[PDB]
Amino acid sequence: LGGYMLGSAMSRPIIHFGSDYEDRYYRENMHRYPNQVYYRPMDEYSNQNNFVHDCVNITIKQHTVTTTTKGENFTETDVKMMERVVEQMCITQYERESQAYYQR
């Protein structure tokens, strides 16, 4: 990373895949999943969804490196479920900082 950073943790977003199976599938292991999200300052630009689609990429990439380095690797469904959890959290982490620009 070397620029991009980590702010706050959250609650685990209860995702909806539409299958209660896949809810509880994540939910059985959810403590092992991510609980904070990697973002960067606006500085120049911002979007509504596309910088979130950037931030999600970084958080999964990091976990696919620095925790995969700890032996703890993931499958693609594990990634896709993370992408959801991380996007959900990134929406709030974006909005929290974005509201502070508005408050200026």
UniProtKB/Swiss-Prot annotation:
Impact noted for substituting residue 79 to I: In CJD; uncertain significance
Glycosylated residues, per the record, are 57, 73
* Annotated consequence of substituting residue 59 to A: In SENF and early-onset dementia; induces loss of glycosylation at N-57
Q: Where in the cell is it found?
A: Cell membrane; Golgi apparatus
Query: How does it get modified post-translation?
Result: The glycosylation pattern (the amount of mono-, di- and non-glycosylated forms or glycoforms) seems to differ in normal and CJD prion.
> What disulfide bonds does the UniProt entry report for this chain?
55-90
Record text on subunit structure and interactions: Monomer and homodimer. Has a tendency to aggregate into amyloid fibrils containing a cross-beta spine, formed by a steric zipper of superposed beta-strands. Soluble oligomers may represent an intermediate stage on the path to fibril formation. Copper binding may promote oligomerization. Interacts with GRB2, APP, ERI3/PRNPIP and SYN1. Mislocalized cytosolically exposed PrP interacts with MGRN1; this interaction alters MGRN1 subcellular location and causes lysosomal enlargement. Interacts with KIAA1191. Interacts with ADGRG6.
Q: Remarks, anything else?
A: This protein is produced by a bicistronic gene which also produces the alternative prion protein/AltPrP (AC F7VJQ1) from an overlapping reading frame. The alternative prion protein/AltPrP (AC F7VJQ1) and PRNP have no apparent direct functional relation since a mutation that removes the start codon of the AltPrP has no apparent effect on the biology of PRNP. In mouse and hamster, the alternative initiation AUG codon is absent and is replaced by a GUG codon.
Domain comment as written in the entry: The normal, monomeric form, PRPN(C), has a mainly alpha-helical structure. Misfolding of this form produces a disease-associated, protease-resistant form, PRPN (Sc), accompanied by a large increase of the beta-sheet content and formation of amyloid fibrils. These fibrils consist of a cross-beta spine, formed by a steric zipper of superposed beta-strands. Disease mutations may favor intermolecular contacts via short beta strands, and may thereby trigger oligomerization. Contains an N-terminal region composed of octamer repeats. At low copper concentrations, the sidechains of His residues from three or four repeats contribute to the binding of a single copper ion. Alternatively, a copper ion can be bound by interaction with the sidechain and backbone amide nitrogen of a single His residue. The observed copper binding stoichiometry suggests that two repeat regions cooperate to stabilize the binding of a single copper ion. At higher copper concentrations, each octamer can bind one copper ion by interactions with the His sidechain and Gly backbone atoms.
Q: What family is reported? A: Belongs to the prion family.
Q: What is this protein called?
A: Major prion protein
Full-length numbering of the shown residues: 125 to 228 of 253
